[PDB]
Amino acid sequence: HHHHHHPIEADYLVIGAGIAGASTGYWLSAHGRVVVLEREAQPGYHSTGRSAAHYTVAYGTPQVRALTAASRAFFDNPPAGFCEHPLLSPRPEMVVDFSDDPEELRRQYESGKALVPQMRLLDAEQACSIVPVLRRDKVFGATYDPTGADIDTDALHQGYLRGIRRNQGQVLCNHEALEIRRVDGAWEVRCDAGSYRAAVLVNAAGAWCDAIAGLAGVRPLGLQPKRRSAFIFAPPPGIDCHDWPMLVSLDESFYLKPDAGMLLGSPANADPVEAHDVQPEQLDIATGMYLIEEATTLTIRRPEHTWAGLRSFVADGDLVAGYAANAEGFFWVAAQGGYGIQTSAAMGEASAALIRHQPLPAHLREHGLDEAMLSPRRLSP
Numbered sequence: 046h047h048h049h050h051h052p053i054e055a056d057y058l059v060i061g062a063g064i065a066g067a068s069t070g071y072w073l074s075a076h077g078r079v080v081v082l083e084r085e086a087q088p089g090y091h092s093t094g095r096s097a098a099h100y101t102v103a104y105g106t107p108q109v110r111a112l113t114a115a116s117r118a119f120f121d122n123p124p125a126g127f128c129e130h131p132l133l134s135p136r137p138e139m140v141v142d143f144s145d146d147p148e149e150l151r152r153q154y155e156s157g158k159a160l161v162p163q164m165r166l167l168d169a170e171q172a173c174s175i176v177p178v179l180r181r182d183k184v185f186g187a188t189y190d191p192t193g194a195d196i197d198t199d200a201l202h203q204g205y206l207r208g209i210r211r212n213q214g215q216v217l218c219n220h221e222a223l224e225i226r227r228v229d230g231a232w233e234v235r236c237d238a239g240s241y242r243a244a245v246l247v248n249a250a251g252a253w254c255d256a257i258a259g260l261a262g263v264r265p266l267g268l269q270p271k272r273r274s275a276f277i278f279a280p281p282p283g284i285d286c287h288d289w290p291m292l293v294s295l296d297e298s299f300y301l302k303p304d305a306g307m308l309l310g311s312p313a314n315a316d317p318v319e320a321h322d323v324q325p326e327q328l329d330i331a332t333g334m335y336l337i338e339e340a341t342t343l344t345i346r347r348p349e350h351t352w353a354g355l356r357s358f359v360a361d362g363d364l365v366a367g368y369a370a371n372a373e374g375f376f377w378v379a380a381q382g383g384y385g386i387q388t389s390a391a392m393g394e395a396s397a398a399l400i401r402h403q404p405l406p407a408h409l410r411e412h413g414l415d416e417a418m419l420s421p422r423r424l425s426p
C-alpha cells in the first residue's frame with residue numbers, strides 16, 4: 046500500500062560504498078550496469094573513513110601480503126584521469142621491540158625481508174636515531190621497511206566512485222538495503238523508496254556483511270568486527286616530527302605516525318563487538334596515550350580528534366572474494382580486516398573478474414593469488 050518507484054534493473058547490485066564496494070564496482074563498471082546501494086548519506090562514514098591510511102606489505106597473513114603487494118602498481122600509476130594527485134606518499138615503517146624478544150624480532154625481519162628485499166634489521170641506537178623521542182632503555186632493536194607509504198584514502202575512494210559514475214554506474218546514498226530476495230532469476234533488493242534487481246548481488250557491506258547474508262537467507266561467514274580506536278594530538282614545541290616513519294611496537298601494542306603536522310596514536314586494539322556506528326572508548330584512548338608516554342619522551346595534553354572503527358575478520362584472518370556456495374549470484378567481498386585500503390586495487394580487480402566468471406588477471410596470478418585462496422569455500426570442511 047505505500048508507493049514505490051518502478052524496479053530498476055542492473056547487472057550487478059553492490060551493497061556498500063566503502064573501499065570494498067567502490068573498488069569492486071569500479072572494475073565492474075566498464076562491463077555492465079553497476080548500482081551501488083549505500084545506507085549512509087556519505088560513502089566513507091564507516092571503516093573506510095576511519096583508517097590509519099598506511100600501506101605496509103609485511104602485515105597480515107600470506108594472502109593479505111600478496112593482495113597488498115599486487116595493489117602497489119595501481120596505487121603508484123593509476124589510469125589517466127583516475128585522480129589529480131599522487132595516491133601514495135613515502136612513509137617507511139619501523140617496528141620496534143619494546144619487550145626484549147630478539148627471537149621474535151628476527152622472525153619478523155626474516156619474514157619481511159623475503160617479501161621486501163630492502164627491509165633492514167636495526168639495533169636500538171639506529172631506532173633511536175630515526176625517532177629521537179624513543180626512550181633508549183625501552184628499545185631492544187627494530188625492523189625498518191623503506192618501502193612503506195601513506196595512502197590518500199579519500200582521493201583513492203573518490204577515484205573509484207567517480208570511475209563508476211563515468212561508466213554510467215550509479216552510486217546511491219541513503220539507500221539502505223532493507224530486504225533481499227531471489228525473485229524471477231534475480232536478486233531483488235528493497236530500499237525505502239524502491240527496489241533494484243540484478244543477477245548478481247555483491248555483498249560489500251563491511252562489518253555488516255553477515256547481516257546482509259541474513260536478509261538474503263544465505264549462510265554467513267562468521268565475520269567478527271573488532272574495534273580499534275585512534276587519536277590525533279599535537280607534538281611538543283620543538284619536536285619536528287614531520288618525517289618520522291610509522292612507528293609500531295613488535296607486539297602491536299601501539300602505533301604512532303605523523304599526520305601532516307600532528308601525531309596519530311593508537312593502542313592498536315581489536316576488541317570484538319557487533320556491527321554498529323562505533324565510538325572510541327575512553328580506556329582505549331588512555332591506554333594508547335599511556336603506552337606512548339612510557340615508550341617515548343612525549344607528553345600528550347589532550348587529543349584534537351578521537352575516533353574508532355571496525356576491522357572485521359573471519360577465522361583465518363584472510364580476505365574473502367568469491368561466490369557463495371549453493372547461493373547462485375551471491376558474491377562476498379568481505380573480511381577486509383586491518384587491510385582493506387592497502388589491498389583494495391587487487392581485491393577490486395580480482396573480485397570483479399571472478400564475478401564476471403573470468404580468470405584472475407596475470408599480474409595478480411604472478412603475485413601468488415588464485416581463486417581458491419580468496420573463496421569463502423575454504424572456511425568450511
Ligand SMILES: Cc1cc2nc3c(=O)[nH]c(=O)nc-3n(C[C@H](O)[C@H](O)[C@H](O)COP(=O)(O)OP(=O)(O)OC[C@H]3O[C@@H](n4cnc5c(N)ncnc54)[C@H](O)[C@@H]3O)c2cc1C
Pocket residue numbers: 060061062063064065066082083084085088089090091092093094095096097098099100220221222223249250251252253273274275311353354355356357381382383384385386387388
Ligand atoms: C583505526 C583503524 C586503522 C586502520 N588502519 C588501516 C591502514 O592503515 N590500512 C588499511 O589498508 N586498512 C586499515 N584499516 C582497515 C580499513 O579501515 C578497513 O579494512 C576498510 O575500510 C574496510 O572497508 P569496507 O568497504 O569493507 O567497509 P566500510 O568502509 O565500513 O564500508 C561498508 C559500507 O557498507 C554500508 N552498509 C552496511 N549495511 C548496509 C545496508 N544494509 N545497505 C546498504 N549499505 C550498507 C555501510 O554503511 C558502509 O558504508 C584500519 C581501520 C581502523 C578502524
Ligand SMILES: N=C(N)NCCCC(=N)C(=O)O
Pocket residue numbers: 097099101103104138140273293297300356382383384
Ligand atoms: N603496519 C604494521 N606492521 N602494523 C600496524 C598496522 C595498523 C593498520 N594498518 C591497522 O590499524 O589496521
